[PDB]
Amino acid sequence: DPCKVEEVCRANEPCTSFAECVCDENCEKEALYKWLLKKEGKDKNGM
Amino acid sequence: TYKKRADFLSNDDYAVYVRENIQVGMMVRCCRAYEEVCEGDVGKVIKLDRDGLHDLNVQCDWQQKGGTYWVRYIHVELIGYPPPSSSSHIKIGDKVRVKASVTTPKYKWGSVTHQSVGVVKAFSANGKDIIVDFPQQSHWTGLLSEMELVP
Numbered sequence A: 001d002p003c004k005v006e007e008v009c010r011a012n013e014p015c016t017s018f019a020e021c022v023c024d025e026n027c028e029k030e031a032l033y034k035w036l037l038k039k040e041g042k043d044k045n046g047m
Numbered sequence B: 001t002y003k004k005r006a007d008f009l010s011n012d013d014y015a016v017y018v019r020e021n022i023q024v025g026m027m028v029r030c031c032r033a034y035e036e037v038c039e040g041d042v043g044k045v046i047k048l049d050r051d052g053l054h055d056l057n058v059q060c061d062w063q064q065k066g067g068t069y070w071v072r073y074i075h076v077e078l079i080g081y082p083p084p085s086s087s088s089h090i091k092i093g094d095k096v097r098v099k100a101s102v103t104t105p106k107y108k109w110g111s112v113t114h115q116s117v118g119v120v121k122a123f124s125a126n127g128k129d130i131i132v133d134f135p136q137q138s139h140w141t142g143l144l145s146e147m148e149l150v151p
């Protein structure tokens, strides 16, 4: 896995897995996007 | 109500001021153009990170750009919070608690309880949640419909 739930989970207590995410948009999505930008050598704006 | 770049000696002095006073939900103006964000564009803060003072810490939804963009503290001038419109009459600075009727809050209890009283810090970008500082847990996220003003 590219990201760890404990690190990116946005709840007031960490979810035990991304499948349990309680946010409207899953916390793993934005995490993967920011991880892919870093892997491409881009900054947060894709620059 | 907020200071501007001209009130400080150095860029880093001003950036520290912006950092201590900015919150999600605030309106800002671009006071120094940066890439896709032109000077004088107006934005609503939608996300704040806390990396180095010169990092891209401030994500806004920008009116003239027509989309989101990350900037640094030095690029923004704080304007203020929008007026209460949630119809909850909860506003920034109010004391709130979780409703007695809530068994488990949407984003979980953390260290908070039904007896906790916290201070509203920000309205979340999604228009449904608030960020609350409780004595037992800072940056606690609540669903507005689960929270109420403390009598």
Ligand code: FES
Binding pocket: A005, A008, A009, A010, A011, A014, A015, A017, A018, A020, A021, A022, A023, A026, A027, A028
């Ligand atoms: S993973 Fe916990 S709220 Fe999203």
